């Protein structure tokens, strides 16, 4: 007999992507090699972010791309997301960028290549910098989805600003007893 519990004995991570497309799995076959035979911890983060889900790879937009590139120090540096560099239309000027992503929106490709930057993908990033030397890794807003507004401390409860699941927003749809001091009680 051994006095240990087995509740968390199985760690819960991914070790392969749940996707079944072959180009992503060739990227995985490349970065498995580049993560265990380099001492760069960039390749482990790229390998771990290739496994992740669509909701764990949120799209990073172009006006946040350029904004996080306009910080000092990180000039003429390539810059890497693992998700999708979408266009942002509420920005007019666009500097030249060295972007490296899995899939870039066609309008964002036109926007970047018009400004004169270049768009690598990951098999080109491996040839350009195997240890990831001189990169800026970025990621989209992971709490950007609307389902992280329904989460947390429940409504009908003091100091909990949670959007409740309501079938149609109006004045008749959950405004009346929990929501008012006049009728019932306020939270």
């Amino acid at each position: 007999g051994v006095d240990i519990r087995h509740n968390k004995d199985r760690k819960v991570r991914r070790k392969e992507p749940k996707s079944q497309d072959i180009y992503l799995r060739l990227l995985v076959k490349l970065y498995r090699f580049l993560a265990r035979r380099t001492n760069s911890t960039f390749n482990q983060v790229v390998l771990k972010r290739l496994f992740m889900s669509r909701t764990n790879r949120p799209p990073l937009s172009l006006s946040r791309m350029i904004r996080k590139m306009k910080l000092p120090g990180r000039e003429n540096k390539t810059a890497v997301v693992v998700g999708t560099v979408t266009d942002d239309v509420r920005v007019q000027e666009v500097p030249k960028l060295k972007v490296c992503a899995l899939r870039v929106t066609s309008r964002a490709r036109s926007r970047i290549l018009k400004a004169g930057g270049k768009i690598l993908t990951f098999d080109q990033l491996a040839l350009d910098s195997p240890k990831g030397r001189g990169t800026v890794l970025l990621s989209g807003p992971r709490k950007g989805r609307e389902v992280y507004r329904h989460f947390g401390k429940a409504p009908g409860t003091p100091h909990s600003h949670t959007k409740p699941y309501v079938r149609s927003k109006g004045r008749k749809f959950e405004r009346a007893r929990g929501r008012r001091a006049s009728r019932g009680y306020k939270n």
Binding site: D21, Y23, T38, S106, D123, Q124, L127
Partner: protein, 52 residues
Amino acid sequence: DDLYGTWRKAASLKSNYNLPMHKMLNTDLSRILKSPEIQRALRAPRKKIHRR
């Protein structure tokens, strides 16, 4: 190429279509792994089996 477009000419016989871009371009993984750009920046391959 008139129907399904080209990589820079769009689809003439559809309305607004263009071929979907690749997720990686150089696909031949053997030449990427056997390349002097990468083979320089690797540690030593330890392959001595150390049994019990």
